[PDB]
Ligand binder design. Structure first.
Ligand SMILES: CCC1=C(C)/C(=C/C2=NC(=C\c3[nH]c(/C=C4\NC(=O)[C@H](C)[C@H]4CC)c(C)c3CCC(=O)O)/C(CCC(=O)O)=C2C)NC1=O
Ligand SMILES: CCC1=C(C)/C(=C/C2=NC(=C\c3[nH]c(/C=C4\NC(=O)[C@H](C)[C@H]4CC)c(C)c3CCC(=O)O)/C(CCC(=O)O)=C2C)NC1=O
Lengths: 158, 54
């Protein structure tokens, strides 16, 4: 997969040129923000259970119809699948935050997710509501460092 | 006519044949390689340019 540094390397290699001053400034900016990004990623990892608990509660308080019979989150199995998908979103958001790039979300998460949900009848707007709830819960904990990755997942899903 | 006049004096050069030039030939090959390298650098710079950006 790709992080920011590999993105810069790939760009320069496709141009067939050595790194220049601008590319070095870009990679230094990446190295500068890296430590804050690891702190955010470690905090998310340590508190992942709490984040899932709060975000699932927020989603199912916003939309109580999902849990009632006939809803897409009505069973132990469909509820477990739902919280599992939120777990996926958080884990891959942490990956993207460490990488500094969203291509891992496009490849491992978004590609085929719309068709999976349409095939199964998962309500995509409600899943986006869940991603937004997770974004708020996570921002309440680490700040605004992971906002762009959740926004990426939300745009890709919608 | 009675002075001693010397008509056919031997030359300095020895009777032997020309010495082989193998070492000189190798050193000229080295200079040719050095000269070839600098033009090869220009053509190699041309080789690394991107594909369809004319
Ligand atoms: C039809 C099949 C089906 C099952 C079996 C089912 C169980 C179930 N119970 C849940 C929450 C819950 N479950 C309990 C029950 C516990 N409270 C005490 O600790 C007791 C020891 C114990 C019950 C005897 C409580 C209080 C909650 C809500 C609080 C929470 O989020 O943990 C949830 C999460 C969604 C929600 O908040 O409603 C599920 C999916 N749901 C289903 O659709
Ligand atoms: C790593 C990236 C990745 C993602 C994102 C992913 C999503 C995903 N969700 C699935 C099912 C599901 N996903 C959901 C979740 C929905 N329920 C709604 O109420 C919510 C709004 C919403 C979640 C927030 C549900 C209920 C199912 C079960 C659907 C069914 O079997 O009918 C399935 C089918 C496999 C299964 O039955 O567990 C996939 C592949 N899989 C992946 O490998």
């Amino acid at each position: 997969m790709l992080d920011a540094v590999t993105k810069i390397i790939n760009r320069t290699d496709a141009e067939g040129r050595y790194f220049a001053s601008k590319d070095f400034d870009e990679v230094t900016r990446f190295f500068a923000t890296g430590e804050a990004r690891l702190r955010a990623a470690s905090t998310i990892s340590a508190n992942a259970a709490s984040i899932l608990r709060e975000s699932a509660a927020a989603l199912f308080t916003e939309q109580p119809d999902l849990l009632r019979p006939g809803g897409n989150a009505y069973t132990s199995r469909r509820y477990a699948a739902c919280v599992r998908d939120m777990e996926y979103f958080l884990r891959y958001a942490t990956y993207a935050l460490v990488a500094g790039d969203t291509s891992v979300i496009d490849e491992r998460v978004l590609n085929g997710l719309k068709e999976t949900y349409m095939s199964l009848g998962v309500p995509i707007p409600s899943t986006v509501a869940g991603v937004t709830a997770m974004k708020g819960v996570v921002a309440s904990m680490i700040g605004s460092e992971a906002n762009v990755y959740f926004d990426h997942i939300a745009k890709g899903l919608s | 006519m009675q002075p001693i006049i010397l008509r056919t004096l031997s030359a300095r050069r020895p009777v032997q044949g020309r010495p082989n030039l193998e070492t000189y030939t190798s050193e000229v090959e080295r200079w040719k390689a050095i000269a070839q390298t600098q033009y090869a650098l220009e053509l190699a710079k041309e080789m690394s340019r991107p594909a369809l950006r004319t």
